[PDB]
Amino acid sequence: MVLSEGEWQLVLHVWAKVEADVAGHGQDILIRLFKSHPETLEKFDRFKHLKTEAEMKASEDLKKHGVTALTALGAILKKKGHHEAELKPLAQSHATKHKIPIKYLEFISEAIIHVLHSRHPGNFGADAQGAMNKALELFRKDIAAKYKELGYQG
């Protein structure tokens, strides 16, 4: 696919709001993913044992990870579709070290869209949500093609 510049604008405008507090958004998003789809928590050997949302909130490791993951996602979105390089090392570790199915990336995309909608309703109207979804669909589609070249899934 290909986003127009206007769509990229809508995506990078609400992302700039996220960047005002990356660690808070990363906690909200990972907790929303683990509460909605608890099977995803099992992929993390580091926090797998967390039993409640309070324990998740208080975990520093979980918060660090959230920052690591959002930061990488932000660096990809800022590329505006020219992210080949960035995607490479990311697709490799997720396909052969962590083993993250495409379905899980869909789950976190849904968690990202849920939190942005809750926190930033003014900058996340229907058109901006359609654009963000488009950008994540692109990210998934390109990672899915990379997984296949690498020998994993699809």
Closest CA to 40 of 113, 115, 107, 137: 107
Contact between 47 and ligand HEM per CB under 6 A: no
- 3 vs 122, which CB is nearer to ligand HEM? 3
Closest separation in Å from C-beta 35 to ligand HEM: 13
**Number of residues near ligand HEM (by CB under 6 A):** 17
Contact 19, 12 (CB under 8 A): no
Contact 154, 102 (CB under 8 A): yes
Chain positions 108 to 127 lying near ligand HEM, rule: CB under 6 A, are 108
- 48 vs 57, which CB is nearer to ligand HEM? 48
- The secondary element (H helix, E strand) that includes residue 88 is helix 84-93
Burial of 10 (0-12, 13-18, 19+ CB in 10 A): buried
- 10 vs 94, which CB is nearer to ligand HEM? 94
Contact between 56 and ligand HEM per CB under 6 A: no
Contact 27, 62 (CB under 8 A): yes
Return the residue matching tokens 């324990």: 55
Return the residue matching tokens 């099992």: 42
Residue span binding ligand HEM (CB under 6 A) among the ranges 4-12, 14-22, 68-76, 118-126: 68-76
Closest separation in Å from C-beta 126 to ligand HEM: 22
For the chain, helix, strand, coil in percent to 5 are: 75, 0, 25
Interacting residue with ligand HEM among 12, 105, 113, 144 (CB under 6 A)? 105
**Binding annotation for O2:** 65
Q: Give residues in contact with ligand HEM (CB under 6 A).
A: 40, 43-44, 46, 65, 68-69, 72-73, 90, 93-94, 98, 100, 104-105, 108
